[PDB]
Amino acid sequence: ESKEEIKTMENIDDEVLLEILTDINWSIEDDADSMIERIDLRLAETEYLFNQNLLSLQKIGPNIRPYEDKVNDECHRIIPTLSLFLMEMSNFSNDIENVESQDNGLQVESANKKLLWNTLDELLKTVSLDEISLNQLLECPIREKNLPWMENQLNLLLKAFQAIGSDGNEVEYNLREISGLKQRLQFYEKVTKIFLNRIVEEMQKKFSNIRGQDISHDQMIRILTTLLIFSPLILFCKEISQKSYQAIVENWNVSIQPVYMELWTKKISQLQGIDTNDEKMNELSLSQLLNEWDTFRKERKTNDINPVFKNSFSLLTECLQTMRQECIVYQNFVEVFFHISSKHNFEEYIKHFNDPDAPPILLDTVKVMQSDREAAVIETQLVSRIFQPIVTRLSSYFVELVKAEPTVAPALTFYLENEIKSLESSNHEFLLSAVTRMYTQIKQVWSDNVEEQVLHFERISNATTNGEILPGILDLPVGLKNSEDLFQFAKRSMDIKDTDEGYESIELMNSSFRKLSIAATRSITDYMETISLLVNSNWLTEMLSMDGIFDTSLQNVKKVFDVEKESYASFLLRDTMPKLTAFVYGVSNIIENRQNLENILLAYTSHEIETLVKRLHTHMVNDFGYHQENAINNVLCDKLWSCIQGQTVSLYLKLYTVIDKHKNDIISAFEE
C-alpha cells in the first residue's frame, strides 16, 4: 500500500542467498538473525584464532617461509652483489663517462648530439595522423589470416595509442599540435565503427555460442568461437580503450553467462532416482555376520547399495559440471577477456599465439570471476537429504573437501563449498542418533519393556525381549557404512589431496562416535536384548571390529558382560550349576542366530530350560533315589542325574546357601 523501492541489485544477492543459506530462510527469522550473530562470533574466534595463530606463531611460520623467501633475498643478496657489482662497474665507469665525454662539458661543445638537437634528436614523430588504414585495412576487419587488420590495422591503432592524444604539442617541440585533434578521433571513430563491429560480433558470435551447446554441455563452439575472440581482446589499444572490449567479453557475456548458466541450471538437476526401503541389504549385512567369521565372509564387501553411483555419479559429473562453472569457466579464463595478454603491436604475438588451454593450470595470480553460483548450490542442495551418506561417503565428501589445492581458480572455494558438503553438511556426523538412542531409549521404553517389564524373571510376568533395533540393522550399516568407505569413497578422488587418505575421520567416529553411540548401546544394556545386544555388537564385531576398524570392543564385552550377568540371571533359577548354562543359557543366544521357560525359541540340545526346571524337580533334586542317583547319562539324566553327575558337590554347596542368610556333619559326610 506504501509501494517500496526498486530492488534492482543492491548490496545483497552477492551470495546473500548463500549467506541466508546458513540454516534456512524458512519463516524467517530474526531469531535466525541472532543465529547469524552466533555464527559471526564463531568466525570471530576462528579468525582471531587465525590471527594469533599467524601473528607470531605462523608469523614464524612466515619466518619458516623466510627460509625460502629470505633465501630469495640471499640469491637476491647476490643480486645485491650483482647490483652493486654492475652498479659499481657502471658507477665508476659512468664517472669515467662524466670526465670522459665532458672534457669541456659544456655539453654544447663536448657532447652536442643533443645540444645541437634539443628537439631535433626527438624528431621521429612523422606518423601523423589519420585515417587511411584505420578503416581500409579493416572493413569491419580484413583479419582472420594474420591479415592487415590483425597484423597492420591493429598496429595502426597502436599508432593511434602511440600518439598520446592529450600530449599534443609542447609547442617548442610541437609534434601533434593540431594533428592530435582527429588522429585517434578518426582512428577511434573508424575504430569506433570497428569497435561496434566487434560488439555486434560479440553479441552475435556469443549468441552463436548461446547456440553452441555441443557435448554435455559443452560450449565447444564457444571455444572455437573463443578463438575468434582472442584477437578482439588482444587488440592492443588497449584493448578496451574505455572498458569496452572487456564489456564485449563480460557485459556482453552477462546475459550470455546465463545462457550457459541457465543451461546448466535446467540441465544438471534432472538425474533424480532412488530406492525406497532396504531391509533386504541389512539382511545381507545381517546375513553377512550370520555366516561369519566363524565362516568365510559374507560380506564380499556386499551392499551398501549406495555405493552404486546414485549420488557419486555427480562427484565426477557435477564436480565436472561444477568444473564447468569453475574449470570450463577457467576455460572462460580463455574467455574472460581471454586472457587479454599478449600481442603488444597491437595484434602481433596473439596474431601467432591465440590458443589457450586455459584450464586450470597452476597457482600464481590474483583475479576474480563469477558464473559458479547455481551449479554449486545445485550440486550441494541436490545432495542435501542424503541420510545414509556421508558415512560411506566419508572420503567422498572429504575428497570433495580436499579437492582443489593447486589451481588459481575458485574450485578451491568450490572444494570449500564441497568441504561445506562435508562440514556445513551438518551433524551427519549423525550423533543426534545417540540422542535418538537415549531419547528413544526412554520415550520408547514403553513398547520393548511392555513385553519385558519383568524381563529376566516372571514376577511382573514379562518375557525377556526388547530388541536391538536402532542400532540393530544399523549395525548392519556399520558394515554397509564401512564397506563402501573403501570402494565408493575411494572412487571419488581428485587432485591434492582427495583420497589420498589422508582423510575420512568420519570413519573414525565410526570408531569414536560409533563407540559413543555404542556407549548408548551400553546405556541400552532383557535377554533377547542382552542376546540382541551382544548379537548386535558382535554382529558388527565379527568382521568390522576384526579388519579391526571400530572402537566398540569394550562396549561389546560390556553389553556381553551384561549378557553373562543377565543370562545367568534370566537362568538364575536354571543354572544351577552348569545344568542349563551351556546349551540353555548362552545358547539361547548362540543358537538364536518369563525367563524360566522362556528360552524355548531355539533351546539348543541338551537339557534345555523346558527340562532343567521340570525334569530336575521330578525325582531328581535329591537323586533318582536320595543321595545319590544311579544315572550318569546324556538323554534325560542331563536334566536329572547327569546334572547331579555335573553338580555333585553343588548339592552340599547349594545347601550351604542357608548357612549365612537367616555343625555341618550329618549332611556333608553321610548325605544318604
- Residues of this chain that interact with another protein (CB under 8 A) are 1-10, 12-13, 16-17, 20, 25
What's the CA gap between 490 and 493, in Å, rounded? 6
Residue 1 CB, nearest approach to another protein (Å): 4
- The secondary structure of the chain in percent helix, strand, coil, rounded to multiples of 5, reads 40, 0, 60
| Least distance in angstroms from the C-beta of 25 to another protein | 7
Cell of 111: 657532447
Nearer to another protein (CB atom), residue 374 or residue 542 = 374
SS (HEC) of 165-218: CCCCCCCCCCCCCCHHHCHHHHHHHHHHHHHHHHHHHHHHHHHHHHHCCCCCCC
In the bound state with another protein, the residue whose beta carbon lies nearer, of 58 and 255, is 255
Shorter beta-carbon distance to another protein: residue 14 or 69: 14
The number of CA neighbours under 13 Å toward the Cβ of 258 is 4
Of 10 and 357, the one with the shorter C-beta distance to another protein is 10
CB of 380 to another protein, least distance (A): 16
Taking the complex as a whole, the smallest distance from the CB of residue 12 to another protein amounts, in Å, to 7
554, 522 Cβ separation under 8 angstroms: no
CA distance 650 to 543: 40
Q: Which of 546, 556, 545 is nearest to 519 (CA)?
A: 556
In the complex, what is the shortest distance from the CB of residue 266 to another protein, in angstroms, rounded to a whole number?
16
For residues 135 and 138, give the distance between their C-alpha atoms in angstroms, rounded to a whole number.
Answer: 5
Q: Smallest distance, Å, CB 378 to another protein?
A: 14
Q: In Å, what is the CA distance from 638 to each residue of 570, 582, 583, 630? A: 20, 12, 11, 13
Residue 244 CB, shortest distance to another protein, in Å, is 23
Which of residues 2 and 270 has its CB atom nearest to another protein in the complex? 2
Minimum CB separation of residue 379 from another protein in Å reads 18
Which CB atom, from 8 or from 270, has the smaller least distance to another protein? 8
CA distances from 551 to 83, 394, 475, 510, 541 (A): 64, 17, 13, 8, 10
Name the minimum Å distance from CB 20 to another protein: 7
12 vs 653 by CB, closer to another protein: 12
Q: Which of 286, 359, 357, 363 is nearest to 328 (CA)?
A: 359
Smallest gap from Cβ 384 to another protein, in A, equals 17
Report how far residue 152's alpha carbon sits from residue 347's, in angstroms, rounded to the nearest whole number: 8
Torsion of CA 215, 216, 217, 218, to 10 degrees: -40
| Structure-block grid coordinates of residue 194 | 570497428
Provide, rounded to whole angstroms, the least separation between the CB of residue 4 and another protein: 4
Residue 492 DSSP one-character state: G
Helices of type H across 235-313:
245-249, 252-255, 258-268, 287-290
Of 30 and 355, which CB lies nearer to another protein in the complex structure? 30
Say how far apart CA 95 and CA 82 lie, in whole Å: 19
3-state secondary structure 345-407: CCCCHHHHCCCCCCCCCCCCCCCCCCCCHHHHHHHHHHCCCCCCCCCCCHHHHHHHHCCCCCC
Contacts of range 286-295, beta carbons closer than 8 Å, 24 or more positions apart: 286/473, 286/476, 286/539, 288/476, 288/479, 288/543, 289/475, 289/476, 289/479, 289/538, 289/539, 289/540, 289/542, 289/543, 290/593, 292/542, 292/543, 293/542, 293/543, 294/542
Nearer to another protein, 23 or 121 (CB): 23
Helices 373-382, 411-419: inter-axial angle, 10-degree rounding = 20
Q: Are 568 and 551 in contact (CB under 8 A)?
A: no
Q: Which is nearer to another protein, 378 or 584 (CB)?
A: 378
Closest by CA to 255, choosing from 202, 330, 326, is 202
Shortest Cβ 265–another protein spacing (Å): 12
Q: How far is the CB of 372 from another protein (least distance, A)?
A: 16
Give, in degrees to the nearest 5, the angle at Cα 66 between 63 and 67.
105
Closer residue to another protein, CB minimum distance, 259 or 404? 259
Tell the smallest beta-carbon distance from residue 335 to another protein (Å). Answer: 22
Task: Please report how close the Cβ of residue 21 comes to another protein at its closest, in angstroms.
Answer: 11
Q: Which is nearer to another protein, 3 or 662 (CB)?
A: 3
Closest CB to another protein among 10 and 121? 10
Least distance to another protein, CB of residue 17, Å? 6
User: Which residue, 196 or 377, has its beta carbon nearer to another protein?
Assistant: 377
Take residue 357 and report the three cell numbers written for it.
588451454
- Closest CA relative to residue 318, chosen from 422, 194, 217: 217
DSSP for residue 545? B
Which CB, 297 or 373, lies closer to another protein? 373
13 versus 73: smaller Cβ distance to another protein:
13
**In the structure grid, which three cell numbers stand for residue 658, read together?**
542357608
What residue spans of 443-552 are helical by DSSP H?
476-483, 512-522, 527-537
